[PDB]
Structures are given as structure tokens and as C-alpha cells.
Amino acid sequence: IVKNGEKWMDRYEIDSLIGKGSFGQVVKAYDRVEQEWVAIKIIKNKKAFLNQAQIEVRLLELMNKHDTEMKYYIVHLKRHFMFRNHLCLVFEMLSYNLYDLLRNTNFRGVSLNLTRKFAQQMCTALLFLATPELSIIHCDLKPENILLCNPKRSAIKIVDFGSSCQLGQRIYQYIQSRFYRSPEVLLGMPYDLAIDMWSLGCILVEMHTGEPLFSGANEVDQMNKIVEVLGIPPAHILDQAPKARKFFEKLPDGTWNLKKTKDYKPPGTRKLHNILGVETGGPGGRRAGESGHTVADYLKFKDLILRMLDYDPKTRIQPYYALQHSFFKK
Ligand SMILES: COc1ccc(-c2ccnc(N)c2)cc1
Ligand SMILES: [Cl-]
Ligand SMILES: [Cl-]
């Protein structure tokens, strides 16, 4: 319960509720010292949420100490303080999220050209998080966690480092939102920064088609929707996976296949080529003839996405090399 007009610490005047989370709530507030509006993320007064939010504060302050071009795709933490036994994180105000943007297209998607602008900003963010001394895994990339800087413009920033961890500081095996969950996490394997790049691949297809690429209703369904597009994962990965046998069965000759329950397209037959409509006027044919939606434009996009959706986290494309892809050229 926070009321409009409520004044905190002779500094902040609470205006309105921006959003609610598992973590607590985010409110619009006026800062009298800086003379500007800010977003205040108010964590619930329960050990679990406080402790995870203390990790979010540490990771944001760690990024803020690195002044470089690439850090300006991450929402700015201005400060944090403790009030009425709630940890409170003060951020810059951003605009609406990319799910809202998709809802506003009635889930028909934005252009290849706006998708490219989002791709390039998000690839730069991931390059920043991969800075050795940072090595931050977001762990929850999805459209909802990508906000416009300004409702008139196509600049974006990532929010919500509530799930985030540094490489080698993993807490939970079960992480990421199901639609954006990487194969290595579905398979219960130790995960690295490559799980964010998997999420990003999923996100960019969704931004252009308007619908999630892999909309599993549970982990079994999720892996089955991935297999439809990408085929059976390579044996070398499945051999090292604790949860391989949640989804696949090993045969003595001809190593792995799907476990079948009661009655999906055959492995690797739901081609990304058709989902994108590379040769058939884009998703549902709705970009037929539009500029920036040529077959050559489409093939570049398909190639970058399939590199982002490599099953092998060690060969999956990394941010620097994604930024050099032809999809971003001239
Ligand atoms: C509208 O402005 C904002 C700014 C930050 C956030 C934010 C920041 C960090 N975590 C979450 N879940 C949300 C939301 C809206
Ligand atoms: Cl979504
Ligand atoms: Cl998570």
C-alpha cells in the first residue's frame, strides 16, 4: 500500500504504480533534489526478495563503475536506500516494454528494419555484460524486460537484473522464462552468458512475426517445440546433460531420439525459413513488396538467428561477432 501524494524522506513524492513483479512493485515518483521523475523499484520486506534484490543492486553498481560506450543499453540505477524495511532501487524513467509494442501491432510484428535496430542495441548490451570483469548473465531476457527509452523513439534498455548472476556465481538450475529458456538450462547443465544470446534469438523472431517462436506450455512441450525447428540436439551435448532423459532416449546404435508420449512436426521440419516467410513475403505474407523486406534481407536475418539458436553454447554466436554479421551492414 503506497498512496499518491505520499512524501518520502523530504525527497520523493509518489505519483502512481508503474508495475508489479514477483520482487515487489515499481512506482513513478518525483525527485525534488535532481528535479526529475524517477522509477522506484520497491522490494517486498521478505528475506528472499531482499537478498535477491541486494544481488541486483551489487550487479548494477558493478556495471556503473565501467564508463564505456556499450554500458548505455542498461537501465541506469541512480541510487538505493532502505525505507520501512523495504530495499528501494531508484532508476531513470523509461517508457513501455517490447511486449506492449507487440500487443500494439495486434501481435503482427514490427518491420525487419525496427527488428534490426533492436537486435543491434541488444547485441551491444550483451557485449557489455560479457566484459570479463563483469561477466553478467541476465538470465531473464524477454520482450517485457526490454523498455523503450522514449515513446517517440526506437532506443531501448534492458531492465530487471533480479535473476542475474556473474559467471561462476550460479544459484538456481531452473531459470529464464520458459519461452526464452535455452537448451542447456532445459537439460539441467551449468550455464554461461550464451543463455542470453539464445533468449535474444527467440526475442527477435517474435518481434518480427508477432508471436513467440517456442511457446511451450511446460518444459517437455518447450523442448519439443525447439526440436521441431532445430532437430535433435547433438549427442555430445545430450551425453553430458543431467535432464537429457526428461526429453530424449539413447539407443545403442543411432544415439538419440525424442521420447514419445501420447499424440509435433518431425524433428527439424518446422523450418525458420517458412516461419520468417523468407521467400513468401515475410510472416503470413504481410510484408510482400515493402522496402527492407527483400529475400536477401530475410536470408541475412535467418542466418544470424540460426547462429543465435546454436544448440552448442560454446559455438553459439557471441555478441562482438553478432555485431559484425552482414544483417547489420550498410
Ligand atoms: C517505466 O520506467 C521503468 C524503469 C525501470 C523499471 C524496472 C527496473 C528493474 N526491474 C524491473 N522489473 C523494472 C520499470 C519501469
Ligand atoms: Cl511474451
Ligand atoms: Cl529466472
UniProtKB/Swiss-Prot annotation:
Tissue: Ubiquitous. Highest levels in skeletal muscle, testis, fetal lung and fetal kidney.
Domain annotation Protein kinase: ranges: 12-328
Location within or outside the cell: Nucleus; Nucleus speckle
Cystine crosslinks: none
Modified-residue entries (Phosphotyrosine), positions: 12, 30, 72, 172, 174, 298
Family the UniProt entry places it in: Belongs to the protein kinase superfamily. CMGC Ser/Thr protein kinase family. MNB/DYRK subfamily.
Positions of modified residues (Phosphoserine): 163
Protein modification: Autophosphorylated on numerous tyrosine residues. Can also autophosphorylate on serine and threonine residues (in vitro).
Domain remarks in the Swiss-Prot or TrEMBL record: The polyhistidine repeats act as targeting signals to nuclear speckles.
Record PTM Phosphothreonine, positions in chain: 255
Annotated disorder: Intellectual developmental disorder, autosomal dominant 7: A disease characterized by primary microcephaly, severe intellectual disability without speech, anxious autistic behavior, and dysmorphic features, including bitemporal narrowing, deep-set eyes, large simple ears, and a pointed nasal tip. Intellectual disability is characterized by significantly below average general intellectual functioning associated with impairments in adaptive behavior and manifested during the developmental period.
Protein name, UniProt field: Dual specificity tyrosine-phosphorylation-regulated kinase 1A
Chain segments carrying region Disordered: 261-291
Subunit structure: Interacts with RAD54L2/ARIP4. Interacts with CRY2. Interacts with RANBP9. Interacts with WDR68. Interacts with SIRT1. (Microbial infection) Interacts with human adenovirus 5 E1A protein.
Residues at the catalytic site: 140
Organism: Homo sapiens
Residues involved in ATP binding: 18-26, 41, 91-94
Summary of the function given for this chain in its UniProt record: Dual-specificity kinase which possesses both serine/threonine and tyrosine kinase activities. Plays an important role in double-strand breaks (DSBs) repair following DNA damage. Mechanistically, phosphorylates RNF169 and increases its ability to block accumulation of TP53BP1 at the DSB sites thereby promoting homologous recombination repair (HRR).
